Amino acid sequence: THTNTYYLRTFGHNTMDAVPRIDHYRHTAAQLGEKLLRPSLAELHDELVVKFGWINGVLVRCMLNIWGVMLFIRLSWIVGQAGIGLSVLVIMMATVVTTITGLSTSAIATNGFVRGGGAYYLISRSLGPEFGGAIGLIFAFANAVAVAMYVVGFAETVVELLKEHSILMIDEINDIRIIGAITVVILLGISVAGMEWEAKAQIVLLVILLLAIGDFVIGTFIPLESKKPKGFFGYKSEIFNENFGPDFREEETFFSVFEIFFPAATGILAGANISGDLADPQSAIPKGTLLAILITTLVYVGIAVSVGSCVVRDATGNVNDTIVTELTNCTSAACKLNFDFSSCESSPCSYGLMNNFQVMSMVSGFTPLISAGIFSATLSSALASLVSAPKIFQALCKDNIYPAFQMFAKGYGKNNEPLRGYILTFLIALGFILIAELNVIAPIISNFFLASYALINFSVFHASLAKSPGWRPAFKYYNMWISLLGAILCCIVMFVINWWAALLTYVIVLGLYIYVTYKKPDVNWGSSTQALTYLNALQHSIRLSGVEDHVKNFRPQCLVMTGAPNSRPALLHLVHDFTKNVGLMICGHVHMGPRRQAMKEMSIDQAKYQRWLIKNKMKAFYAPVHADDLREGAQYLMQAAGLGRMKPNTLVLGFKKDWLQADMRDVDMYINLFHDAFDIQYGVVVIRLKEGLDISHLNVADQKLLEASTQFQKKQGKNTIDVWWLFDDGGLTLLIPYLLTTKKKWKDCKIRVFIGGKINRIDHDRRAMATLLSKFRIDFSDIMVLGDINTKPKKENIIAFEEIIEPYRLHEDDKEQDIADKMKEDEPWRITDNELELYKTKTYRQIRLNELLKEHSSTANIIVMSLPVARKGAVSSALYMAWLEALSKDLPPILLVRGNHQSVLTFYS
Amino acid sequence: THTNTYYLRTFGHNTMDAVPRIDHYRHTAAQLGEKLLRPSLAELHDELVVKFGWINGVLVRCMLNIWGVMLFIRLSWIVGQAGIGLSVLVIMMATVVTTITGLSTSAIATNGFVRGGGAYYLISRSLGPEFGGAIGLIFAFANAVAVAMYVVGFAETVVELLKEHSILMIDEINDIRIIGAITVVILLGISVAGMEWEAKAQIVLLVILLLAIGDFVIGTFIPLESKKPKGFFGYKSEIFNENFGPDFREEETFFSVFEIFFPAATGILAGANISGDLADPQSAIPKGTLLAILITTLVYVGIAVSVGSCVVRDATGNVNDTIVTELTNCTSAACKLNFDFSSCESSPCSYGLMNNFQVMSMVSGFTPLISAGIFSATLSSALASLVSAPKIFQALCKDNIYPAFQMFAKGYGKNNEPLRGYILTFLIALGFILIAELNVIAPIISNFFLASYALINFSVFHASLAKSPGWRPAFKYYNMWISLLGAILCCIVMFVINWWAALLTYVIVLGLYIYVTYKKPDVNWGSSTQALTYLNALQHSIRLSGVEDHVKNFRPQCLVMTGAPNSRPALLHLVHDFTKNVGLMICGHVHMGPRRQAMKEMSIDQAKYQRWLIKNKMKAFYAPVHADDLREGAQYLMQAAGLGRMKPNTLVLGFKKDWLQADMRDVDMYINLFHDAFDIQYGVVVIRLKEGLDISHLNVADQKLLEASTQFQKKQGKNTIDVWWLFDDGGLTLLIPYLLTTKKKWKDCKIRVFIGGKINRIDHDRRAMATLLSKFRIDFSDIMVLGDINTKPKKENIIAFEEIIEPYRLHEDDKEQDIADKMKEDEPWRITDNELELYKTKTYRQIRLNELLKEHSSTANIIVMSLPVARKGAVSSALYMAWLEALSKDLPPILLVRGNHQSVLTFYS
Ligand SMILES: Nc1ncnc2c1ncn2[C@@H]1O[C@H](COP(=O)(O)OP(=O)(O)OP(=O)(O)O)[C@@H](O)[C@H]1O
Ligand SMILES: Nc1ncnc2c1ncn2[C@@H]1O[C@H](COP(=O)(O)OP(=O)(O)OP(=O)(O)O)[C@@H](O)[C@H]1O
Ligand SMILES: NS(=O)(=O)c1cc(C(=O)O)c(NCc2ccco2)cc1Cl
Ligand SMILES: NS(=O)(=O)c1cc(C(=O)O)c(NCc2ccco2)cc1Cl
Ligand SMILES: [Cl-]
Ligand SMILES: [Cl-]
Ligand SMILES: [K+]
Ligand SMILES: [K+]
Ligand SMILES: [Mg+2]
Ligand SMILES: [Mg+2]
Ligand code: NA
Ligand code: NA
């Protein structure tokens, strides 16, 4: 029926359904998605500029940042004060911390597409805005200060080089400050020039540093007799054996050495912070960072061991001190080789592995080459930090976490460059350089770095804890327990060095976290915090599902038929008063009208009203439902609403005030709602107000209605709480008012109970009731026993009730049997004469109860009375409505309660 | 119509409804007559021996138990080693701990009738069986050991009194052993004699103790020169000032003094342990315990101050006197009055406050009275402990918490008295007396008492934390924070003295708690633990209700329509595999039949199936519903099931295997269930098995069906998962198999992806799909692109489909245009020729897809394929069912998935 070419066309061209394509999931505004538009379910169902590679962008950056001052200056001192083994152990511990941090970072960076800000973006998108902003501020400031520290190191090295000659301008501190200012200006200029220039400069510095390392390694293998007077002796096993072990020749300990060394391993995130300029993160960051860490650790360990195997701790440089005669009785490591480096214990000798900070330069075949290597290392580290800080700050400011800093987010040029961030970082670094004494500052910045690492590790662990299906990290060489251990180790290490610095950093982090949480920025990124919230709720619900029910653990789980949650405020607040912190509260709303529009109406209403309830401080659940009429929607809610053991057991309704001026079908639906509630074993609570409950539409009447709506919101003075417990429903009638009095807004109100008694047994019945409610431990102010019930109500009230009921009567007696049956068939709510004759006693009881309530409980703050139960099929809906209206007419706020008839009170324990 | 009578009769005689009466809430066997019967809601709605008072039962017992050895023996030593102020401080600290414990006990004992036992009953009924059993065992053993210690103290005092004369039988330790054995036998006899006899003995002992205290107080006010050589001097401000302030003569310390004194504060629970024999608790325990504590503390403090204000720390027995008309050169308090009790700073003088342990006897005006008082105090404390232990043990054994001890709950006599418990306590006490050296044992028992007190305080705090409406304590003189502070103080105090004893007691408590929780005795007391479980679930749900939705936080919340949870095991386990630990799972069951019987059936099913699910380790929720047909119940569940944000979003049901051999109305209801799910914005998952899903009714066919049911309960093995993602439904089709692979039972299985492409573009489409799913980070083992779709399926398959569809065609073309319309109206599921002509392409697509699946995925462990969506009103129900049947048949387990069409996957972070 068609050509063979047609049968081989593109799959999906003959159907509205779309094949899965990348454009369906991309949100980027690329050509507005001309063809990347997957059809919605309704449509198918409804009736008819510069990017860097991983090598240059991550590996080189991380290596340059990690290698700093200690590479050529303080490594020898560390290997001296602590033996080869102890120094290697310190290096390995720092490397372990950094490696755990790198694994966590690689895991976090392989989940989605990272945009900008290495540590900040990852931490924020994986944990939440609070932690994200706190760590962003901390890390940015730490990098800004590290820029100054590196510049100061370079300046001090150059000043020492000048002091090696006659060149000098001012005192040492002032010369250091001048050199630091000049160097920081040069670095700022280079950084502002552009990112490609920075990359080229970094490559040059890296090659210079590698040349310096190679020069040192070559020099250590070419001993010269001239260096023999100094500590250098070549590779001798005697020196290696002697240099082992912790000869702490000063007021310093192992922990102090570790603290001194640690800043040497705090450049691992240089590549990550360039995520905004990486060609392809999720493939460059992990491998580059891990390789850089491995290379730097290997170089550190090798250099430490080599320096410790070819230099003596103490060596008194003196040409006329070698030879050591011919035969010696000296057991010293130097003595075994030559007399050089002898008699140093008493007289403090010039240098050696313990007192000289230029041993690496001396060992190297070429000294100026090592000097250039030191310069390049320090400058490279400073440049990396100075580039990293503005990127993190701009990423943090783009999110508007701190509105005051929104200025430092604008970009310049083809590639968005935070020039303002660069200027701010330059200012901070220049200030800290002008201080020129960063010895005290260093522990604080080290602790800042450790806090950032620990929060990265904790973010990985937290994400692995909340088993969100979106976690799905691409990197598969991590572990939740390893990451948790890494976070704990980071905290412990930060506390080990400068405990008070650790306390200060923790205080700062906590303060920033609290500020951000209070601010609550308007943004959600799908952090693991929300996933953990859902998982915790689910686990707690599952746990509660296995708990057996007990009478003393009973709580009122009320399904309030409120319509729009804001439509009826009085009912909502009243139900909230005895439900908050005790029992569940579901606000049920039934939507009518066309299903097509009702679906969108309910979809909007869900979010709108849940947000309204949350913002209004009411701990309720919105439960929208779409149904033809109110009765069937209530049926839906009473059958399915809730989850597990947290389902409703009480139905709360507002009184149908306008039942007289309304279609009898609506009244029938109301009474049938009552009947269904009773049928499914539900407690029923009806709240009646003189003015009504609905204020959505909203003269004198409107003002009174609004006042009634707002009445149950302030402190309820102390007037009374009248409970007319006439029938034993199981105790709910008494449990409601007690829970009311248990709240602050109702504490001043006293509960006085009304019961029906015998005329000649008033005292006995009163005592029995008092004892019964004392066993229940329900405080009461007074007990009134009424013997006037069952009396005939006044003639006027009966006449009024009859006049009210006349319109809805059937008058079967005065009509033909067939006509009466036909009338009752299509109007089932009609009141039959037989039922009126049968229940004249109940009608008189309702009227007399209204009389008694008016006479006695006419000044109560709120009234709780037993709700009459009409046998289904025996009493008409109109008769039930008339009973309810007569019972509670012309009264202050009243509640009609009819419990499950299962006991909800107990005097046993 | 009625006389004056019948108008003033008892309220409630003319109605089935009952007035509230205590008989309605009493559950005791007696008083269950017709009068004390509350009518059920259905019945109203359906269509037509010795008891002690608080004084002698609690106050006297508590006072006698609290007062023990230290009252007349070591109080002087305590006031000596420490100062008056420090001794008062230790007394006040112990009293504070005991007073907080007493407040907590009175709070816990005023929350209903306490049946029997002592602290065990209160702790169990307020906290749970685990804590109850642990504390019961600990407390009973502690009381038995305390009996042993009191007997040992009495024996030691009597042995010392004998040594004061020329009376002795064997070595001191052996004589102590004989005296202790005799005393314990006498105490056991007295206790077994009854309880009234014990009360009379206790009253006699209390009178003797009061006489002894009065004798001491009288003696301290009548100084005699004979006792002047001893430390006694009468009241003198010089001695008071001298004795004020610590003087730790020996290797003692404040903490050691506190540890020595603390056992003096125990015994506050003697009255509460006789709760089963009190006239009424909730009125005797609180007041009696508090008054006893107050009186004992006042007496302790007064005696301490009096002894420290009228006796010198060091004194000499040399009657020769001192300061015989000499000059006053010494500032010692003794010199102020006379030289007596001086000059023993180097040599150890005879006795005094520091050295003598009978100063109270000497100070008193009649030593034999003080000796009798010591005897009475020790004997009364021992008797109280020996009575308390068996009561607690019997209460613990009556609950069957430890089945091995069920034999000790038996009672004897008119009043249930545990004789076996008495014998066991006597045996334990006799053994510990035979040890005769309880110095090392005292700290352990002290820590046991402290643990009991701390857990009482923690029970009060926990009850106040779980805001159960049944808490309602009658004693309104406590505080949750005060009780928590008391528990913490008890723990800290127990750890302060004998830290290793505290660790041992904590280990024992933890072990007993773990054993009880593992055993999980079948008991339900309505503890604070269950209330806290409910409250925690509610709070977590409320918190989750305020969390905004995100694509990466999406979870599959599946409303699996399974009927009876055990009826279809394969479907339940399959849904559990990709829902456990990730997303919600509600098992929906629809009940049909008469409403009256259906309600009871659903009520039974709720408990039965929730228990079955919990016992079978399935984290699902049972959701019963009563409706006329399956569609109505599914509508109920899809509209109302769930709570807050934890509500279903995916519909899972089994394939209607027997649709061909079934009424077309049922098939129409099935297809309309599909349509309703799509309309309500639900994802739909259909699971089809060759043999079916139902195994409730269950030859070869039955065996195969059972094997299919059990197939998915084991480890899958090195099979493959075939995903035919043909249409972009949002990613659910791919999300489900990934979640399957996330679990251990599906680790081996690898995901194979099938997509539709164009011939001559296979490589490009395969690369694009691989890239797209690599950005999603879902691992795959291979990607197959099929270009042979849209081709005409074999003639035989089309003929078979036509033959299958024949009995449901409308055949409108060969009709009169009126009979056809009538048939369509009567049976809307009829397949019209117009729709068949329109969707021949879709039919051929289904047939060819089945061909491709059989040819390619015939060996997959499980198949996931996109579920075709039929436009509502355009495709008949019969045609939709035929499409589904043709698409899947003669295939391994297959899942048809049609997501919400909202994206559930993302490559952004
Ligand atoms: N969607 C709904 N529409 C109307 N009433 C609802 C709805 N959902 C629950 N209800 C409950 O059913 C009752 C019906 O009252 P109705 O509006 O028929 O009489 P009314 O005198 O207008 O009441 P109100 O003063 O509350 O408007 C309300 O009090 C309300 O609590
Ligand atoms: N109360 C229920 N009664 C019947 N089916 C239900 C019910 N609740 C949910 N369902 C789902 O609807 C499907 C209807 O199956 P049906 O009663 O037609 O028997 P079937 O086609 O032989 O399949 P099965 O082997 O599951 O019985 C079931 O697979 C089941 O998953
Ligand atoms: N102690 S040091 O001179 O060898 C040293 C060495 C280095 C270094 O990077 O090797 C270093 N980096 C900057 C830094 C400080 C805190 C965190 O990072 C700082 C210092 Cl003080
Ligand atoms: N230290 S004491 O001799 O004055 C003493 C005194 C008492 C006493 O009850 O006064 C006491 N009661 C029994 C007990 C031990 C642990 C807990 O309770 C035990 C002792 Cl050892
Ligand atoms: Cl870093
Ligand atoms: Cl006690
Ligand atoms: K570094
Ligand atoms: K005691
Ligand atoms: Mg209205
Ligand atoms: Mg079936
Ligand atoms: Na560097
Ligand atoms: Na005693």
Numbering used by the authors:
A (entry chain A), B (entry chain B): 203 to 250, 282 to 931, 1002 to 1212
Authors' account:
Na+–K+–Cl− cotransporters functions as an anion importers, regulating trans-epithelial chloride secretion, cell volume, and renal salt reabsorption. Loop diuretics, including furosemide, bumetanide, and torsemide, antagonize both NKCC1 and NKCC2, and are first-line medicines for the treatment of edema and hypertension. Here we determined three cryo-EM structures of phosphorylated NKCC1 individually bound with furosemide, torsemide, and bumetanide, unlocking two modes of interaction of loop diuretics with NKCC1. In all the three co-structures, NKCC1 assembled as a C2-symmetric dimer in which two TMDs are separated by ~30 Å within the lipid bilayer and two cytosolic C-terminal domains (CTDs) interdigitate and associate extensively with the TMDs from beneath.
